[PDB]
Structure formats: C-alpha cells, structure tokens
C-alpha cells in the first residue's frame, strides 16, 4: 500500500521511517526513530507488536529477529574491545557523556579478563540533533576508533574525523530494542539487559542466562 | 532523509515504492513500478542509473545484483516446469492473454526434453488493473499453479482461487529488470532476452551463453 502508509506516518509525526516486509498477510513492518510499528498495506491500521510466530512449538519474537540482523548488519560500525580468551560477546549501546558509561569503559580490561567481549553502538540519551551524536560520529569515523573513544573518554581532545557513518542508525535501533538508558547491553540473542552491571556480576549473569536458555 | 524522499514521489507521480539501501554515500535505491533510481538522502536529485562497483577488476551491476535477490526472493511464487534432465533455468515473465505466450507453453515438453527448466512469473502487458492481473492473480492463488496456468491456457474455465500473492511484485520486478513485453525470458545472471525464441534456438542460445559466460 506502500505509499499510503507514509501518509499515516505524515500525520502520527514520523521522521527517519523504514517500511520492511512483515510475515502477515496485509502487513508491513515499519522502523522508527520511536519503536518498530505494523501497518496495514492501506496505511489504516497500526498496531504495537511486538509480533510472535507460532507455527511451531515455541512462540518466536520475529521482531527481534529482524532487529538482530540489523544488528549484525551494523558489526563493521561497532567498536570492538576483543576478549583475550573470549567466553561471550555483549553489544552495550552506550554515551560519551553518561557517568556509568564512564565507569564501564574504565573496567573494560576486567570484562576483557573475564573473556566479555565488548562491542560498542552509539547511543545519545539527548537525542540526535545534540553535541553527543556529533562527538560520537566523529568518534565512530576515526581510523582508529578504539583510540579515538579511549581517547575522548579519558578527557583528551580529539580533532573530529568525518565519514558517512550515521548514529541516528544506531540510535534507533536501541530505541526500537527497548534502549531507554546507557549503557544498555544487548545479549546475543537480543535480550537487553539495562543498566550497569559490574565486570564480576555481568559474568556471572551472561554464564548463568547462556545455561539457561543453551538449549541443553 | 528517508521521509522527504517519499515527498519527492508525492511530486513525481510514484505509487508502489519501496526505499533499499545504496552502496553510494548519501544516496538510496528507489525501487518503482517504472523501473529501478537511485535518490539523494535528502530527496532532492535523482539519477536513472543502473549503478556499477568498480573496486575490482571488472564492472558489476549492483542493480542486477539487487534485483537478482528480489527475483530469487519470488521462487515460492513461481510456476515451475521442471526438466527431466535440468541443463538451463529460466525465468519467464508471461501473459495469459498473449498470443506468444500462448506458442511457448504449448511447447513447454519440447523446453524440458531439451533440459530447460521454465520458471513463470506474472507479466500482465496491460498492467496492474486489469482482467489479466485479475485471472493471474486466481492462477497464482490455486492449489497446483501448474494445473491451472496449464487449465487457463488451454480454454478450460477455471473457478478463482485467492490468497495472498501479488502480481503488482511479480510485474514491478520485470519492469525493473528492463521487461517491456512477453513472453521476456530472464537469465541465471539476470540478462533480460526479449520476446520469442522457439524450444530448439533456445537451446541453442543457452548452451552458447553458457560457453561465453562460464569463466573458463
């Protein structure tokens, strides 16, 4: 219906919009800057979700799944701190400006040791027209972007590289993953985990959810 | 820019859009009814394209790159007319009411004896409301699609079946990938081959493509 629909969105107050199929019938996804929508193909009818497929024996959160592959489609844009020895992989939407983001990258050696990976998205609490998104954008766009974060986050200044690099990408994509807070840790099966957890209780948490939900 | 891009349709006379991703700076792919652009984030230029990646040796279509994945993304939707010894897969895009349409099915056993495997998509020349979208769309719907192209195409009535397939995807597609008229027969690698070649030139035209195209 798919032009209609962004006549709806044109009055229900929407900006960055990306209509994707959904897998009902007279139906479409819709990503926002706000939350994942579904919408009737006549753009009439919006519903919440999130959206489950029971055709089987558990319900699967297909609306976590096609943000888990964007997700996995933003890898190249993510800062990666490599566990040594590597146990498990957390993706943490995360602020310069936010105190216990602060507090967070000041252990990162402790998750490392630990074997937590950490993989870093840009998440400004102010919103994207704001001083966070251009700090961070220019963080994300350095050759080097560990150093550049390390760097901007231990107070040095930092001359500000530029690409085609966009937070409002990653910002949305917390938003649409429930994010409402930094640092908000997403697991690798899409669970998000707000807030901050110590390097110790974060490894006793992710041993204790991944013999839980292994699947035996 | 991805909401003022739909502005710029709503000016350009545009009905089923849909916005993908571009692997260019700042601009997006702009799948139309009419054909594949490419549009500035911003909405505010267009270019016709097809668009190339060069970072290699030789220069690939990453439109019919695309369009390979949409065209694949539709095998469920296909009428299928397997050879018994599969030696060539085409795509055709076809028309009930076509005249020539009509010649290529009747020789569908001499294609498969020859090991060409036909593939039908939903091509109606008189577009998208019209009676052939309409009988298309019951054929498509029907229990064995087979049975009922084979039923339609020899004279038989054939009560309507409904579902949830569209011809408007199948038909926007073969726009898209420069079908201007049936029967069009697609190839593996995306090249469009207008109109008519009997079972025999057809064969013939294949196994020669086949020996240019390989990579040795």
Chains 1, 2 share one sequence.
């Not at 798919?2 to 919009?17: C, E, N, P, R």
């Not at 844009?77 to 020895?85: F, G, R, T």
């Amino acid at each position: 219906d798919d032009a209609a629909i962004q006549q709806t969105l044109a009055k229900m107050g929407i900006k960055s919009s990306d209509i994707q199929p959904a897998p009902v019938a007279g139906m479409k996804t819709v990503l926002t800057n706000s939350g994942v929508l579904y919408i009737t193909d006549d753009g009439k009818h919006i519903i919440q979700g999130p959206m489950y497929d029971v055709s089987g024996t558990a319900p699967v959160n297909v609306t976590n799944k096609m943000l888990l592959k964007q997700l996995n489609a933003l890898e190249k844009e993510m800062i990666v701190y490599k566990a040594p020895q590597e146990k498990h992989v957390i993706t943490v939407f995360t602020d310069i400006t936010c105190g216990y983001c602060h507090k967070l990258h000041e252990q990162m050696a402790d998750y490392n040791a630990l074997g937590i990976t950490v993989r870093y998205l840009a998440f400004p609490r102010q919103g994207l027209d704001s001083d966070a998104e251009k700090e961070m954008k220019a963080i994300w766009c350095a050759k080097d972007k560990n150093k550049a974060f390390d760097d901007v986050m231990a107070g040095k200044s930092v001359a500000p590289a530029s690409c085609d690099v966009d937070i409002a990408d990653h910002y949305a994509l917390g938003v649409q993953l429930g994010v409402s807070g930094t640092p908000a840790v997403v697991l690798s099966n899409g669970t998000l985990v707000p807030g901050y957890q110590p390097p110790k209780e974060m490894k006793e948490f992710l041993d204790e959810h991944q013999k839980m939900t292994s699947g035996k």
